[PDB]
């Protein structure tokens, strides 16, 4: 033993440990090869299986998700995705000694608005991939009951870890879509607050056009110029209240 | 022959360290109570400096060369900002990683070998114990040093011997570009690092009852 120092030393004083040390070293030389493979295959199987199950469960309840994540209602008038805004409160930074910098609120533009064609679905942010694996490349195997049991338990641990990894990835995707939706709703809120200039668009038109071989009826050009942005004259901000 | 000493010292160090650390953790609340850093933090979240004091010093250089002074004070660490007070842990807690691999190469074979191995392991483990105790002693000394320095700074400031630290805050309104904005930016900058004043004419004394 090691913890109960004197007891462990008096136990090692007998030669039974001095003969068991060789019989355990000969096993400690080799066993790791089996366990690494067991962990790898367990991780693979767990990841794949958990991903498939969670994908099925996700598809089960699409309709409510579709209803809640209505990007179409958020699309602007001219088929343009509104920009994305981020806001932080109670910011503090110690740049170095003797000097600190703080602020109450800060606002940042994440993604500049642009034209859109279709309202992006949640699937582009949530749909887990799934490729069924069918390649168990088992080279080495346990020989006796002890190695078989350790193989089994290590495979179980690998399955656990794969489940954890899959769940974490799903959570990360959820966070991403959450922050995107939050940015859009924040932009809507601030535009209501009258603190950000609305996007500005111009349109030009021409009648018939083309040569004697190619013709068009009405060539209409829509071009957006004034990108949305934050204002600096706070005095124009209109406050809000409740009841 | 000497692997005995090595493993004994390692095991003793580990065991004594674990026991002392767990005992310290068990006796927790009074430790943080006595070592209350935060209430000594100044107004502007500025960690006060640390003072070193000495009395009745004398140094001999050589023949006909001796320099004697009554009292001396020194600024150990200059004051600086802080976001959270330090605790007893960063001075008193000591690490512990248990060894478990006594390399089984030289093993007891004959009786006298076993006996000398046992006794050498015992003495080595005692050595490890006392070495851990000495390390604890050094840690205690260091933390006492820092706390006493803070106290001495407070007392000299009370006696009007060290200028208090000085800071300025500059505030700006809206700031940024069309993409980035900040409501109110506050810049805090310190100028007067506390230091001793040699002008004794303004020194103040106090008398109790």
């Amino acid at each position: 033993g090691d913890t109960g120092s004197l007891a462990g030393l008096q136990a090692m004083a007998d030669s039974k440990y001095t003969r068991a040390q060789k019989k355990q070293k000969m096993g400690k030389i080799r066993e790791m090869a089996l366990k690494e493979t067991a962990l790898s295959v367990g991780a693979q199987a767990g990841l794949a299986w958990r991903a498939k199950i969670i994908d099925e469960q996700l598809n089960k309840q699409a309709r409510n998700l579709d209803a809640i994540y209505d990007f179409n209602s958020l699309v602007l008038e001219h088929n343009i995705l509104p920009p994305v805004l981020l806001e932080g409160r109670n910011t503090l930074n110690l740049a170095d000694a003797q000097s600190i910098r703080i602020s109450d609120r800060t606002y940042k533009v994440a993604k500049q608005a642009h034209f859109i064609t279709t309202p992006p679905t949640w699937r582009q942010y949530l749909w887990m991939d799934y490729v069924k694996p069918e390649a168990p490349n088992v080279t080495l195997l346990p020989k006796t009951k002890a190695e078989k049991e350790i193989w089994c338990i290590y495979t179980e641990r690998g399955w656990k870890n794969g489940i954890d990894q899959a769940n974490t990835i799903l959570e990360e995707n959820i966070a991403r879509i959450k922050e995107d939706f939050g940015g859009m709703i924040l932009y809507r809120k601030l535009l209501a607050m009258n603190m950000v200039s609305p996007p500005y668009v111009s349109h030009t038109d021409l009648g018939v056009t083309g040569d004697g071989s190619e013709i068009h009826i009405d060539d209409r050009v829509l071009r957006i110029t004034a990108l949305p942005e934050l204002n600096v004259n706070s005095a124009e901000w209109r406050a809000a209240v409740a009841k | 022959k000497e692997t005995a000493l090595s493993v004994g010292a390692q095991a003793g160090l580990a065991w004594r360290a674990k026991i002392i650390d767990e005992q310290l953790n068990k006796q927790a609340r009074n430790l943080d109570a006595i070592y209350d850093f935060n209430s000594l933090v100044l107004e502007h979240n500025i960690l006060p400096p640390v003072l070193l004091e000495g009395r009745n010093t004398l140094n001999l250089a050589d023949a006909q060369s001796i320099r004697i002074s009554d009292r001396t004070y020194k600024v150990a660490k200059q004051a600086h900002f802080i976001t959270t007070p330090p605790t007893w842990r960063q001075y008193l807690w000591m690490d512990y990683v248990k060894p478990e691999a006594p390399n089984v190469t030289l093993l007891p074979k004959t009786k006298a070998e076993k006996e000398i191995w046992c006794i050498y392991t015992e003495r080595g483990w005692k050595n490890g114990i006392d070495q851990a105790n000495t390390i604890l002693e050094e840690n205690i000394a260091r933390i006492k040093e820092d706390f006493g320095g803070m106290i001495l700074y407070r007392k000299l400031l009370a006696m009007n011997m060290v200028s208090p630290p000085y800071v300025s805050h500059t505030d700006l309104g809206v700031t940024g570009d069309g993409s980035e904005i900040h409501i109110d930016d506050r810049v805090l900058r310190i100028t007067a690092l506390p230091e001793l004043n040699v002008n004794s004419a303004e020194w103040r004394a106090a008398v109790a009852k």
Partner: protein, 78 residues
């Protein structure tokens, strides 16, 4: 070793609580998720409460932490 012993048995694991729910309406006294509140105030680790164990390797036993402080306990003797 039954967490819901003398109860209905395990129903599932609430992750927001990090706890099992017994078949009868109670939270078991066992955890399921590592992201729960466990009240532990004792642990281990060399180079602890500093920059951690520095990834360097030394021919001797001298070991240092990323804060630059050394640790005799983590190192060996001679």
């Amino acid at each position: 070793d039954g967490c819901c012993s003398k109860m209905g048995g395990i129903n599932y694991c609430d992750s927001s609580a990090g706890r099992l729910v017994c078949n009868n309406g109670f939270y078991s006294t066992c955890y399921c998720t590592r992201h729960a509140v466990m009240d532990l105030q004792f642990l281990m680790g060399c180079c602890l409460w500093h920059g951690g164990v520095y990834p360097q390797l030394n021919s001797s036993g001298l070991v240092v932490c990323n804060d630059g402080y050394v640790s005799e306990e983590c190192s060996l003797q001679k």
